[PDB]
Amino acid sequence: EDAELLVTVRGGRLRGIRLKTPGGPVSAFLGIPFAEPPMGPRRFLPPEPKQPWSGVVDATTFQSVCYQYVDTLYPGFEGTEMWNPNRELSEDCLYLNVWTPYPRPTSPTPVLVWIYGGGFYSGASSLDVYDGRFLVQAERTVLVSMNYRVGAFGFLALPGSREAPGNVGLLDQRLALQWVQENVAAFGGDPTSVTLFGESAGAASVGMHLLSPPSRGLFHRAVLQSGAPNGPWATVGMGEARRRATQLAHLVGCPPGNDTELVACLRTRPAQVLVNHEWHVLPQESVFRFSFVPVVDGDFLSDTPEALINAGDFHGLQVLVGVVKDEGSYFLVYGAPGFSKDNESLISRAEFLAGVRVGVPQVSDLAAEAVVLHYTDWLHPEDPARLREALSDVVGDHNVVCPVAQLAGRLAAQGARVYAYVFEHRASTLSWPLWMGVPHGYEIEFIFGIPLDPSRNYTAEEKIFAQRLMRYWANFARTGDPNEPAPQWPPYTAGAQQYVSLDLRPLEVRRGLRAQACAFWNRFLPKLLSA
Amino acid sequence: EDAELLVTVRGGRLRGIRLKTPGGPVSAFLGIPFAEPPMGPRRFLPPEPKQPWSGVVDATTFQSVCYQYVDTLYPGFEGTEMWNPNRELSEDCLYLNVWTPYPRPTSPTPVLVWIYGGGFYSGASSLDVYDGRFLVQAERTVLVSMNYRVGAFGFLALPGSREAPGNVGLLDQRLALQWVQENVAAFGGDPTSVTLFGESAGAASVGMHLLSPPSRGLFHRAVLQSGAPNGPWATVGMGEARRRATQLAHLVGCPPNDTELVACLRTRPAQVLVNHEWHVLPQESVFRFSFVPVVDGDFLSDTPEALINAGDFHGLQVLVGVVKDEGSYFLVYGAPGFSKDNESLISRAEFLAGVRVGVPQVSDLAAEAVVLHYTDWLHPEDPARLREALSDVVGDHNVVCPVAQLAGRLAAQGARVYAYVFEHRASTLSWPLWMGVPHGYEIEFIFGIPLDPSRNYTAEEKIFAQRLMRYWANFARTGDPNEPAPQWPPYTAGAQQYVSLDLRPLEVRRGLRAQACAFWNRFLPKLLSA
Ligand SMILES: *[C@@H]1O[C@H](CO[C@@H]2O[C@@H](C)[C@@H](O)[C@@H](O)[C@@H]2O)[C@@H](O[C@@H]2O[C@H](CO)[C@@H](O)[C@H](O)[C@H]2NC(C)=O)[C@H](O)[C@H]1NC(C)=O
Ligand SMILES: NC(=O)c1cc[n+](COC[n+]2ccccc2/C=N/O)cc1
Ligand SMILES: NC(=O)c1cc[n+](COC[n+]2ccccc2/C=N/O)cc1
Known part of the structure; x- marks a missing residue:
């Protein structure tokens, strides 16, 4: 038995795997249970912590993808298939992953914790573009990622009720963060230096953890990629959420009144059936709107994210935010x-x-x-x-850029040091048409170092570019400054509004994240x- | 005596005066009475045609300026005093002026009629910048300008009442226009070729004559320089007009019945009325004027905006334009x-x-x-x-975008429109350089004032003035400013082409602040x- 692949967490013992990378080996613990399976009576409920186990749990492969819609628009097309579940759909999906250097670090090392996106209705930590092996080998970081319930299973809310309180998908993420504080040291990791980073709905989730006090104590820096909690899509009011929870029940057949009888009927329905009607709930066929998203309930979020952003004191916090060059084009082909x-x-x-x-x-x-x-x-x-x-x-602008810009400015003015980017490199392997430019989500594969995979066909230049971007992110995780202690990345302030561009060329500084356009969306x- | 300086019109005989020019003389007939003096019981009433006279009317000097506010903000400053009255004020002010070539033309000559601006509260045809001698020597048209009543005397309205129906200053202009049709031929003019041109409130006046059928059959072409009848300042509703008239009565000690209130205002010295007209404005503004044309269904059957969109303007040629910095002048006043x-x-x-x-x-x-x-x-x-x-x-709000909206609607409804931006700053300009080319400072080039050797203009500016007089007169003759050379294309709603007027040759450009004016005209x- 390899001693490096054996680790004891507070729940029991784990066995991992040694992953090969071009640079060398890394230790992966994939599929660690952190909650009791939220099934049957536990559907729509907050996560219960994983009861301790005897023996050794093999954390050797990614566990199931949480139940979710599968996009069928361009079947077989790489640009859409890369985001679709690469594991089986199951409601037994509350598992997290841990990557660590081989051999285990001697002194404590900082953590990155990935929260995937997918409109709060889809996504999985098992996707190839989230492969943690390259980052951890290249920068000697500990990377954690977790699965969280999406769709009605994670964000259906009958607000006020105990059976469908809403926001349980966020509590899945929180419990995973709690797991990281209690257990990451066992993997040679530093629980006093934990950086959340996520993309899209993941970035929005990161921001809501920033605005929820019980989550703030669990991490120390944040990275928000092409998303923000204050986006017009990331939350719903209690009334709206309730109207979407019962409308889903009605198209499903519930009831054939009491909130408990309503959801109890919903629990008797097979998971696919909820997914297939999930949608027919939205008040209008649109783009960029999602039926079940976090609810402004007064609990997880005491007020709306904007009210919280505006009222918050953010001294001692460091944030890295950014967008792609063409945030918009990806969503127009969908309707x-x-x-x-x-x-x-x-x-x-x-x-x-x-x-x-x-x-x-x-x-x-x-x-x-x-x-x-x-x-x-x-x-x-x-x-x-x-x-x-x-x-x-x-x-x-409405959905991503302007919400991110508004967040970055309030944070900078209220005591946080902000750092902003625009990702403008169009991958050589991009399967989307040229007119879409640099679409939403296509900087992720460079942050995770995917071009270093020998199976892939990126240029030698793109490989160096990923190595530079991996260094920026890890520098921020360790120092809270992406700069090497070479052109300098200036912090973003409400006045200067400086950000840098990320592509094959060296860093160039610019001013304004669509300042004229975002004045319309955030002010008028x-x-x-x-x- | 000089027979060229004697003309007989319907009302009687007049005697003119020869004036000099560096290009030769011209004939002037200044101070021709075209209305009965609107005094006493005639105050606020529509003008009455001047009754015939015996003897010879002395038409050798400008007549009195209509009672108006005098700008005292920078006393003695040129840029200020050039617009202030240069004759004594009087309610006896309804006189017009005719300039003809010397000797008088034998064939019918195209006529230009000038309507001055001044916010409908000031202005005079006697001002040096409106001197017609140069235009008519260089281009051999007949030029007419009239005084019309301004301020409360021209536009105080108690709608519905007969004692103060409003818009009488516009009727003064119409009456002078009727006078031209009846009498311009006696000076060599052609009443079948009358081009109106005006600036600021005069441009808005021109536009209103475009939109009023009784005026429309009285001229053939129109030039609107830095003004429109659809400006947010050029008209006022019936209710707001009535409120302003009653407040002015209160401010002058009149109570508080339309008949009793007009009667009491008729007792007040004219200067008392002037001293208060600005104080009836509901706000502390720039670019808003107390007594302006009223939309009451008579002179204007509807709002100028409504009448513009409904109009068929085939057979109409219009010349419109603005200066480069229309707004700067108005900001130093508050x-x-x-x-x-x-x-x-x-x-x-x-x-x-x-x-x-x-x-x-x-x-x-x-x-x-x-x-x-x-x-x-x-x-x-x-x-x-x-x-x-x-x-x-x-x-933009007050001039450029109202102009752009009028031009677009007229073009898309049958009119041939020519648009310009005047971008030359005169070497003699007394205003600071941050004001650029201010409102009002294209006029002196249009009237060929640089040709006067007593002034301090450059050789390049004299040629510029001659080119501008040529454009305007070309348009008055043919409806096309182009010399029958880079070409001035018509302005269309889609292409939105206009030309810049400066010492450089004509440069064609697109869009009169298309982005800014979408905000003002559409959103x-x-x-x-x-
Ligand atoms: C570009 O494509 C869109 C999408 O529809 C296409 O139609 C298929 C038959 C196939 O050829 C694919 O390229 C696309 O999926 C076109 O919009 C469609 O237009 C038709 C007719 O006007 C209409 O029946 C569809 O409903 C439209 N679809 C949508 C989503 O609006 C569009 O016309 C194409 N543009 C071109 C060819 O210039
Ligand atoms: N639950 C649903 O049925 C459902 C259907 C469609 N969508 C929107 O999906 C289209 N889409 C739109 C934009 C980007 C991605 C995708 C697809 N992702 O899997 C959400 C939920
Ligand atoms: N009666 C009025 O509405 C009114 C409005 C403004 N002013 C004075 O405004 C100053 N001003 C502003 C711009 C141009 C000229 C002048 C001055 N008059 O010659 C007088 C009367």
Whole structure:
């Protein structure tokens, strides 16, 4: 028996595997149970901690993907299949993974904890692009990632009720963070230096842990990649969540009233059946809206994330935030009129005006025209190419860039040191069409060092670029500064608004995360909706 | 005596005067009475045609200026005094002026009619900058200008009442226009070729004659320089007009019945009325005027905006334009932090205060949309950028975008439109350089004032003035400013082409602040409704 692959955590003993990487070996503990399986009577309930076990649990492979919708838009196409479950769908999915250097570190080492995205309805820690072996080998870091319940299984809420309190998917993440504090030292890891990093809904989750006091004590730095908790999609009100919880029950057949009788009927339904109706709940066919997301309940989140962002004191905290260059294009192929991955998507003006209401759903007619005013070039009001880029900017700015910018500015002004980036390299292996640019999510594979995988076909240049980005992230985890203690990465402040661009070229500093556009979304448009 | 200087019109005989020019003489007939003096019981009443006279009317000097406020803000400053009255004030002021070539033309000659501006509260046809001798010597048209009543005397309205129906200053202009049709031929004019041209409130007046059928059959072409009938300042509703008239009565000690109140105002000396007209404004503004044309269903059957969108304008040729910095002039009269004697480098708090002063409403959220569009959010506190931005706010809202909207609607409904931006700063300009090319400082080049050797213009500016007089007169003859050479293309709603007028040859450009004007003409209007 290899002593390096045997570790004792507070619940019992574990056996791991030695993963081969180009640089050398790393120790992986994949599929460690951290909660009791949330099934049967435990569906929709907060996670119960894993009861201790006798013997040795083999943590040698990724456990099941939490039950979730599978995207069928472009079957067999790499650009969509890379995000689809690469394990079996099961409600028994509350397992986490740990990567550590081989041999185990002598002194305590800082942790990265990955929270995957997927619109709070999908995602898994087992995806190839989340493979932790390259980061941990290259930077001698401990990487942890966990599965959390998505969809109705994680975020269906009948607020006030004990059976469907909502936000249990977030509590899954919290329990995993609690697990990291009690047990990461056994893997040679430092529980006093734990950096959350996540992407999209993962980034939004990271932010909600920043705004929830019981979670704040579990980590010390944050990285928010192409997402934020204050995005118009990341939360719902109690009333909205309740209306979506019972509408799901009705299309499912519940009841054939009491909140307990309602959810008890929901528990008798097979998991696939909830997934298949999940959607038909949204008040409007849109893009960038998701049926079951965290609920502003007064518990996990005492107020809305904006109220909390604005009222928070963030001294002693370090944050790394950023977006891709073309946050918007990925979502337009999924339902906006005139768009496909298989043509140039040169839309008409009528299609642009229609796409605006799909991309900015649930707003007054006056609000929609303000969007049309600011994003139309009135010297070329009908140029199809400009209309396509403009719609991409609309839903990209509204959903991602402007929420991230708003967060970064409040954090910087209120005592946190912020660091901002725009990821602008288009991978040589990208399967999406050229007009989509640098789409949402396609910096992840470079942060995890995927180009170092000999199985893949990235250029030698892209490999060096991943090694540089891995160093930035690890530098931030250790120091809270991505800079090497070489062009300097300046902190982001509300005034200067400095960020750097990430591509094959050296770091270049720029100012403003779409400052003109985001002034519309973060300053004016809220005051239009009140009045 | 000189037979060229004697002309007989319907009302009787007049005697003119020969005037000199560096290119030869021209004939002037200044101070021709075209209406009965609107005094005493005729105050606020529509003009009555001048009754025939016996004898010879002396038409050798300008007549009195209509009673108006006099600008006392920078006493003795050229840039100020050039617009102030240069003749004595009087309610006896309804006179017009005719300039013809010398000797008088034998064939019918195209006629230009000038309507001065001055916010509908001031102005005079006698001002040096409106001297017609150069235009008519160089281009051999007939030129006419009239005085019309301004302020309360021209536009005080008690709608419905007969004692103060409003818009009589516009009727003064119409009456003079009727006078031209009946009498311009006696000077060699062609009443079948009358081009209206005016600046600022005069341009808005021209536009209103475009939209009023009784005026429309009285001219053939129109030039609107830095003004529109659809400006947020050029018209007023019936209710707001009535409120302003009654407050002015209260301010002058009149109570408080339409008949009794007009009667009491008729007893007040004219200067008393002038001293208070500005105090009936509901706010502390720039670019808003107490007594302006009223939309009452008579002169204007509807709002100028409504009449523009409904109009068929085939067979109409219009010349429209603005100067480069329409807003800068108006900020030294009240925007916080501005002066002509400093660089006016304002702070954000001043810029924000200056937005409520430039765009008098809405009361709460509309102000927010303006500051959003006009802030550079990478440089939100740069004073130089804020000075320039508040100038754009005032200029766009009040002039540029009303012009752009009129031009687009007229073009898309059958009119041939020519658009210009005047971008030359005169070497003689007395205003500071941060004001650029201010509002009003294209006129002197249009009237060929640089040709006067007594002034201090350059050789390049004299050629520029001659080129401008040629464009305007070309348009008055043919509806096309182009010389029958880079070409001035018509302005269309899609291409939005215009030319820059400066010492360089014509340069074609697209868009009269297309982005800024989308906000003012498309979004903002909808915001108010909801
Ligand atoms: C670009 O493609 C979109 C998407 O539809 C295509 O139609 C398929 C038959 C196939 O050829 C793929 O390229 C795409 O999936 C086009 O939008 C469609 O247009 C048709 C007719 O107007 C309509 O019936 C569909 O409903 C439309 N789909 C959507 C999502 O709007 C678009 O016209 C194409 N643009 C081009 C060719 O310039
Ligand atoms: N629960 C559902 O049925 C359901 C259906 C569709 N979507 C939206 O999915 C489309 N989509 C839209 C944008 C990006 C990705 C994807 C697909 N990801 O798997 C969410 C839930
Ligand atoms: N009666 C009025 O509305 C009114 C408005 C403004 N002013 C004075 O405004 C100053 N001003 C501002 C801009 C141009 C000229 C002048 C001055 N008049 O010659 C007088 C009367």
